[PDB]
Design a protein around this ligand. Structure first.
Ligand SMILES: O[C@@H]1[C@@H](O)[C@H](O[C@@H]2CO[C@@H](O)[C@H](O)[C@H]2O)OC[C@H]1O
Ligand SMILES: O[C@@H]1[C@@H](O)[C@H](O[C@@H]2CO[C@@H](O)[C@H](O)[C@H]2O)OC[C@H]1O
Lengths: 533, 536
């Protein structure tokens, strides 16, 4: 009867909420993880099921070589004229003065149906949004990226008409809003409400200064006046609040004439050696999606409970409906294709990297490139979505040289991961090795190599995650586990720990095989258990 | 007449020398520059002409997104059984514990003919090489990359048989050599000389500790005995020597029964307010190729003149054969094909970025991504090949917003370049802007903006390179020039300045257009001049 935030747990940022009659959908960004964009469905705003992942083919999304946290940034999902519209980006440069990336449009009739081939829109900035103006005309909003040395990089909100018949942006482009002193003006969404235009934006950047700003105007092109108690959403001032980084919002008006606001947020683990006011913490689950309720006064919306958001939010006047779980707690790969919660890095899942059919009821992975490669990785993984869980798998892998390895991986990006892999030692045979990579600093800490007897058909591998730490354990028969006494830090796989300009995903766990010799040696995984506790 | 080194000036590393009858060929690496591999041709070893660039299709080489100084590393060109064999690499990771990359083989009847589609070989290490054993067997050598924490990454030289009929490696591989205390053992090339196997390698890394070591064995798989005066080539001990980084060599026996050694080298610019011992210099021309004469004693080759290598080298007993230049000093773009000294970053030249046929007598570049992008840049460039030159172009470009810019660029990688571009300012109209990117730190130092009047159809742009410094200048009438008073440092476009694990190319100059608004706004370049000051 209450909305319990985050409604989308783990890596699920930049929520774009829309209503198709009485059905509610939210699209979230996926960056380098393939297939692109996740769409969730809900009938009550409390329970959400993973319904679709539109960008399924390289003709829609080609991300081989994309930088970490490049690819699909904030998307925009809308419904109008009997079809869904998805505006998405493919960001190619995430560091330095430029942010080279391109905005595209695909359409579909059903969210889980077949999506069109993309139409080129523009490249002038990220967070593109498609606004269906009451007049029938259509408009694309985005932030304007300004590379010039002396200018703040977030130059404001651009507006330009989209011609449906010509399938291109037309007319003149106009900057309609420059933002507030919070700056980093971002995430524009336009709304026609009571004959006036409301421009919702994000400001402050997506770390702990994040905020949602709103302004209004009589004309679509402004000038816009800013909310008198702006920002309407932020946790910048409340470091102990359990919801942090609260911004990048979208508004929905329900079919019950109620008002709600979806936004991203982070749930940080804290230091204890440090003050939370100075060290705001680390978010291994990345940026998650939460929903707040809005109330109106004098033509201005307000977040009920205050600007920081609540964990428990007043659900709308609608019939509750839960959904069946969309993954197996223990997946034995008996299904025809990979479950919808598994994703690959950058490229589609094809025989290049593995198969679910070649060895039935197994996931076969052909050894390809290492975990530091932005190109071709034989790696299938799924999100951390709880601070407390166990993941476990069983691998048949018989490597012949030290350049072959396969096993269980916990992963943030190409420079930040840990891996417990079956590999080969030329003087010891098959061994089990722990490899740790922290901002490209690589170590293999076990001084005592773990030998695997030759006739063990399956090495059982398991990770136990307990909030701020996690540990690996292994078994040669499943009913007898041995724990590796190296406590790994969960905070080292978080938005707030990794270096670089792209820090936008979250921790993953999955099965991986690599063969840097060229032989493409396969690794057979009998099952994958993901059990939150 | 002597051989004058370097024989290939500017960015021309990892020479693989090769002989077909009385014709000599040398392949060099090209990294992210497309098309891949440069093959030069010679009949006297003194004069070399740019003859072919084999890897022209995305089916042979797909480098979109490749890191700076990834892509085509050291190649191997050989001639046997009436055809050419090219072994090349595509490196995808250049930083950190791994070096993910793949080695391929392609063949052709002539170097400037159509090359085959690639056969996969292995992925175990770079510097792959094909050996043609007198028994008719074929073998692939390459270094072995060890990623493990406690091990030196250069784990020795691997050897494995290649089956021509099965189009794949067969049998087991074996490490046949582990190097000397110089380590970083790489660049393996096998030679069968009077019933003895000689294994040539590079050691020391490609900076100032570079060396060429050689060893011999009665059997192909070792054990190998190292040269008694090893290494046979290096300038590590001679900081003042005009050739530095001397290593990564290959040997050829001429049809005159003489022996020569092709190797890479750097010609550094030195600061005479810095220790020549501590700071060995900066090479904006990258790694170039030189040739040394060999001489034998007791079954060991020695480099004539000492192991530092000579600047002037005794030529083989062959007739001089000079070649006419393969580029125009002023290229006016009247051909429907880009001159062979022009390259693009990572991808083919297609309508996606440019056209020489849409506006006749112009190079039209369609505005695409910035100079920091590893994907789709409308950028056509050619090597710095002298310390003294000027390059010049003329651009027709009418930008309508600040995200459109086109002009003349000096470039090393995506983090290191300068650019003089026609662009647009909301308050001032068309302006000429100087942009500087030093290891991704970005500046635009002109305080007073240069206003371009609306009546000006072409803006003329020039760079004048004078060894350690270069300067841009511009003109609205081709005859009256104004110098932009900020001296730029040529040493910042050098192997020795840029950060990261990939530092393997060299400085380029070329024409560029970017449009990060999305409109693909075209810029038309009327000509490109590149004129070396041979007087110096
Ligand atoms: O576009 C989305 C936003 O949530 C956010 O956008 C900005 C990207 O650059 C960062 O430096 C800013 O902090 C951030 O606000 O991140 C990317 C994507 O998730
Ligand atoms: O493969 C060629 C070699 O000349 C050289 O190989 C090594 C690559 O890693 C660097 O750290 C070493 O110094 C270098 O010797 O560079 C690449 C290519 O030119």
């Amino acid at each position: 009867m209450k909305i319990t935030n985050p409604v989308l747990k783990g890596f699920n940022p930049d929520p774009s909420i829309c209503r198709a009659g009485e059905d509610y959908y939210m699209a979230v960004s996926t960056f380098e993880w393939f297939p692109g964009v996740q769409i969730y469905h809900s009938k009550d705003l409390i329970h959400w099921r993973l319904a679709a992942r539109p960008l399924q083919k390289t003709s829609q999304l080609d991300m081989k070589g994309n930088p970490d946290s490049g690819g699909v940034w904030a998307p925009c999902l809308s419904y109008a004229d009997g079809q869904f519209w998805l505006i998405y980006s493919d960001i190619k440069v995430v560091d330095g003065p430029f942010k080279d990336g391109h905005n595209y449009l695909v359409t579909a009739d059903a969210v889980d149906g077949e999506w069109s081939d993309p139409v080129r829109l523009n490249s002038s900035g990220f967070d593109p949004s498609l606004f269906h103006d009451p007049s029938g005309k259509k408009y694309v909003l985005n932030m304007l990226w300004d590379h010039r040395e002396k200018h703040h990089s977030f130059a404001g909100i651009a507006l330009q008409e989209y011609s449906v018949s010509e399938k291109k942006l037309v007319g003149e482009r106009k900057v309609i809003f420059k933002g507030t002193p919070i700056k980093l003006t971002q995430a524009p969404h336009l709304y026609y409400i009571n004959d006036v235009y409301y421009l919702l934006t994000a400001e402050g950047g997506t770390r702990y200064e994040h905020a949602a700003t709103i302004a209004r105007s009589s004309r679509i092109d402004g000038p816009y006046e800013v909310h008198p108690d702006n920002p309407i959403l932020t946790a910048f001032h409340a470091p102990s609040h359990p919801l942090q980084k609260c911004g990048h919002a979208s508004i929905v008006q329900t079919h019950t004439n109620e008002w709600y606001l979806a936004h991203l947020t982070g749930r940080p683990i804290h230091s204890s050696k440090e003050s939370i006011f100075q060290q705001r913490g680390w978010c291994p689950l990345g940026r998650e999606t939460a929903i707040q309720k809005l109330e109106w006064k004098d033509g201005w919306p307000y977040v009920v409970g205050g600007k920081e958001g609540l964990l428990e939010v007043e659900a709308p006047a609608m019939s509750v409906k839960e959904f069946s779980p969309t993954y197996h707690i223990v997946d034995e790969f008996k299904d025809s294709s990979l479950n919808r919660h598994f994703q690959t890095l950058r490229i589609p899942f094809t025989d290049q990297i593995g198969s679910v059919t070649e060895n039935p009821h197994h996931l076969r992975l052909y050894g390809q490139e290492s975990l530091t490669s932005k190109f071709t990785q034989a790696f299938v993984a799924r999100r951390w979505q709880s601070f407390y869980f166990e993941a476990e798998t069983a691998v048949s892998f018989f490597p012949k040289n030290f350049q072959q390895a396969a096993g269980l991986v916990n992963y943030y990006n190409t420079e930040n991961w840990t891996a417990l892999q079956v590999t080969y030692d030329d003087a010891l045979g098959r061994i089990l090795e722990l490899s740790v990579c922290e901002n490209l600093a690589f170590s293999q800490p076990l001084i005592k190599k773990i030998i695997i007897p030759d006739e063990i058909p399956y090495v059982y591998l398991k990770v136990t995650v307990q909030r701020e730490t996690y540990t690996y354990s292994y078994s040669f028969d499943q009913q007898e586990w041995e724990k590796i006494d190296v406590p790994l830090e969960s905070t080292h796989l978080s938005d707030d720990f990794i270096r670089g300009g792209g820090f936008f995903t979250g921790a993953f766990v999955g099965m991986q095989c690599q063969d840097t010799s060229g032989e493409r040696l396969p690794a057979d995984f009998k099952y994958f258990r993901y059990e939150e506790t």
